[PDB]
Design an enzyme around this catalytic site. Structure first.
Site, mmCIF file in Angstrom:
data_model
loop_
_atom_site.group_PDB
_atom_site.id
_atom_site.type_symbol
_atom_site.label_atom_id
_atom_site.label_comp_id
_atom_site.label_asym_id
_atom_site.label_seq_id
_atom_site.Cartn_x
_atom_site.Cartn_y
_atom_site.Cartn_z
ATOM 1 N N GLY A 124 2.931 5.663 10.144
ATOM 2 C CA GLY A 124 4.181 5.291 9.524
ATOM 3 C C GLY A 124 4.933 4.165 10.195
ATOM 4 C CG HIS A 178 -0.362 0.151 2.538
ATOM 5 N ND1 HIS A 178 0.349 1.265 2.940
ATOM 6 C CD2 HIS A 178 -0.386 -0.684 3.611
ATOM 7 C CE1 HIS A 178 0.754 1.102 4.192
ATOM 8 N NE2 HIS A 178 0.321 -0.072 4.622
ATOM 9 C CB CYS A 192 2.953 0.631 7.376
ATOM 10 S SG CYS A 192 1.579 1.650 7.871
#
Ligand SMILES: CC(C)(C)c1ccc(N(C(=O)c2c[nH]cn2)[C@@H](C(=O)NC2CCCCC2)c2cccnc2)cc1
Ligand SMILES: CC(C)(C)c1ccc(N(C(=O)c2c[nH]cn2)[C@@H](C(=O)NC2CCCCC2)c2cccnc2)cc1
Lengths: 298, 298
Positions: A142, A40, A144
């Protein structure tokens, strides 16, 4: 004298890189000459509801992915998608790559999490894969790409990559082949964690830890059958107990001389009569994020 | 969504070595060309009650200290004692030495602990220097020499080295100049931790964390004076609150709009009326091992 212990994070810290695509930055994992990161990262701010990832990736070139390993930028020489992960072949092989493996964990199992932001490790903590396939993590914007892991001998077992927060504040992600834990998807939708339950295997392991650390007040003289216990377990949102669990608790049962079904009669009494102000291993609640393996390790 | 977070341990893992003297093995810390470790490594099994360390060390030579950095053994070229630490000058300078400093922490402050056995890092967790100068750690036999630390930017601040377990299961050690925290000594005596107390600064920081994470049920309309609060604090074995603490909680007070003495009236109500089954930040007790600095970091 008994607590959540994370594995030493040095072997994973060496593989943490930053991956930037347009306006989006997030963390990735650099093993050998590959960088794995959530796909993503190529989703655009406008297209969060219904992105088509095959579509968005055909439109990218190697030069649309900035990869920074600390000071030094790496050059990407190829790219592909594996389920919900992106794979970026880079020019350099990571010299600090450890002996490693990719594993898919099961609910109840625990692992350490290296929380990272912009490629920079910031924290390490232990948690468990919940039965509803979410994790109760401490991830901010952030995070991820942060990974979760277990270490045996010198061998890192990567089991989770973080992708997203769900509306209740718990977290979803994938293994390292990009398959999600649970029925979650890497888009903005109306998806929620299903109802969670308590990990009975882990509570029983903890009570055995408590016994081994000299706390013994909750024991009793009764026994229970597995079916008799599972009726109490259902009333209190606990996972049913199986023979497989009873077998897993064998070594712990032997070490303390307390039969598993005895410990179950103990737990059943705890669930029905509360703790009435006492503490187990320093806690006033029933901990379910230590495994049988974790208890023995400590 | 809020928990104990340890610093990433990679920078300290590179400095962990094994130090053997006769029949005794324990961990040491290798920075540049020095290895620091507890001096009681030279105590003998017969002499644990009344060792004289000046005496035992004059009798040693460089060749009585085996130092193993992983596979490779290091040669010792000198040795001395600094208070309760031994300093071993070795031939090689550690190539993985980080930017580092030695600091002496104060009660209430927190740090990460790298638990090691036989030079091999095994675990990392967070804890706090208790007011009675002990730490509630998870140390087993041969954890001596394990260090505790904080990391700011790239700079490791070593604040604790572990030496010994006290009879209640808590732990004593030194800073990195070898001066003990508390009135403890590195012999077998009849020494006990003094009575402990609850770190009021840290509880108040936690309540502010809870407020910031959206939990707000314990707030009330009342205020308290510092003297009025300290009478309740003494009844419940809490550290008195000072103006210095009120000042430290300033930024947290501003962020949430809740005046410090308002939060104190809140805490006083919690202490007098219990939690009656509710939970704060997932806990049913009042956490005192997060600092104001820790809460902001998360
Ligand atoms: C595109 C897609 C899949 C919907 C997405 C969007 C944003 C992020 N979040 C990034 O922080 C982030 C994103 N890219 C770089 N950082 C955060 C996140 O999940 N908000 C959710 C709230 C809106 C509904 C879906 C996502 C986040 C916060 C705290 C801890 N973990 C992640 C994750 C996934
Ligand atoms: C000589 C001296 C100073 C009395 C001493 C002796 C033994 C150790 N202990 C080592 O395990 C050990 C010693 N040397 C290598 N390992 C353990 C320890 O403290 N038992 C105490 C019980 C008897 C009274 C004094 C010490 C230990 C256990 C768990 C976690 N931390 C340390 C520490 C200090």
């Amino acid at each position: 004298g008994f607590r959540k212990m994370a594995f030493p994070s040095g072997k994973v810290e060496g593989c943490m890189v930053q991956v930037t695509c347009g306006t989006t930055t997030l963390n990735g994992l650099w093993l050998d000459d590959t960088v794995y990161c959530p796909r993503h990262v190529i989703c655009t701010a406008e297209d969060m509801l219904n992105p088509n990832y095959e579509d968005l990736l055909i439109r990218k070139s190697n030069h649309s992915f900035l990869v920074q390993a600390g000071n030094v930028q790496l050059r990407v020489i190829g790219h592909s998608m594996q389920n919900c992960l992106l794979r970026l072949k880079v020019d350099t092989s990571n010299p600090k790559t450890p002996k490693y493996k990719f594993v898919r964990i099961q609910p109840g199992q625990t692992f350490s999490v290296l929380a990272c932001y912009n490629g920079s490790p910031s924290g390490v903590y232990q948690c468990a894969m919940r039965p509803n396939h979410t994790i109760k993590g401490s991830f901010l914007n952030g995070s991820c790409g942060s990974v979760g892991f277990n270490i045996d001998y010198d061998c890192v077992s990567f089991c989770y990559m973080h992708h997203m927060e769900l509306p209740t504040g718990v977290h979803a992600g994938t293994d390292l082949e990009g398959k999600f834990y649970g029925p979650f998807v890497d888009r903005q939708t109306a998806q929620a964690a299903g109802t969670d339950t308590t990990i009975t295997l882990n509570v029983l392991a903890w009570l055995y830890a408590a016994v081994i650390n000299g706390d013994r007040w909750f024991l009793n003289r009764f026994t229970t059958t597995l079916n008799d216990f599972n009726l109490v377990a259902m009333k209190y949102n606990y996972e049913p107990l199986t023979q497989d669990h009873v077998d897993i608790l064998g070594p712990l049962s032997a070490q303390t001389g307390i039969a598993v079904l005895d410990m179950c009669a103990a737990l059943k009494e705890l669930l029905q009569n509360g703790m009435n102000g006492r503490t187990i291993l320093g806690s006033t609640i029933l901990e379910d994020e230590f495994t049988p393996f974790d208890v023995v390790r400590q």
